[PDB]
UniProtKB/Swiss-Prot annotation, chains A, B:
It is found in: Nucleus. It comes from the Eukaryota. Plays a critical role in homologous recombination repair (HRR) through its ability to recruit BRCA2 and RAD51 to DNA breaks. Strongly stimulates the DNA strand-invasion activity of RAD51, stabilizes the nucleoprotein filament against a disruptive BRC3-BRC4 polypeptide and helps RAD51 to overcome the suppressive effect of replication protein A (RPA). Functionally cooperates with RAD51AP1 in promoting of D-loop formation by RAD51. Serves as the molecular scaffold in the formation of the BRCA1-PALB2-BRCA2 complex which is essential for homologous recombination. Residues 9-48 form a coiled coil. Residues 39-52 have a biased composition (Basic and acidic residues). Homooligomer; dissociated upon DNA damage thus allowing association with BRCA1. Oligomerization is essential for its focal accumulation at DNA breaks. Part of a BRCA complex containing BRCA1, BRCA2 and PALB2. Interacts with BRCA1 and this interaction is essential for its function in HRR. Interacts with RAD51AP1 and MORF4L1/MRG15. Component of the homologous recombination repair (HR) complex composed of ERCC5/XPG, BRCA2, PALB2, DSS1 and RAD51. Within the complex, interacts with ERCC5/XPG and BRCA2. It comes from Mus musculus. This is Partner and localizer of BRCA2.
Length: 62, 62
C-alpha cells in the first residue's frame, strides 16, 4: 500500500475505494452514536460500590 | 465485531474508538479528495490504445 501520486486509479481500485468510504462512513455514524450515549449520558458510569467481590490475588509475587 | 450493552465502553475501548473515528476521518478526507481529482477531472483515464506494449498470451500456452 504505497501512496503513488501519478497514474489514475483503476476500476478495481475505485471499487475498493468507494466501499472504503461507505464502510468507514456507516460504522462511524453507528459507533460514534453509541460512544456519545456512553460518555454524555453517564447512565452506567460505575459509581463507587462495595469493592468486596470474588477478587483474587492480582499477581502475588513472593 | 461484537455489541455489548448494559455497561458502557471501558477506558481502552474509548481510546481505540476515538482513534478509530480520527483514523477513518483523516484517510476519508485524503482518499476521497484524490478519488474526485481522478474521476471528475478525467485528466488521465488512460484512453483507447493499441494492445502492442508486449501483450501477454491469455491462455495460448495450450
Amino acid at each position: 500500500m504505497e501512496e503513488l501520486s501519478g497514474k489514475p486509479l483503476s476500476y478495481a481500485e475505485k471499487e475498493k475505494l468507494k466501499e472504503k468510504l461507505a464502510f468507514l462512513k456507516k460504522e462511524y455514524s453507528r459507533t460514534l452514536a453509541r460512544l456519545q450515549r456512553a460518555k454524555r449520558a453517564e447512565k452506567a458510569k460505575n459509581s463507587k460500590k462495595a469493592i468486596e467481590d470474588g477478587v483474587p490475588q492480582p499477581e502475588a509475587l513472593e
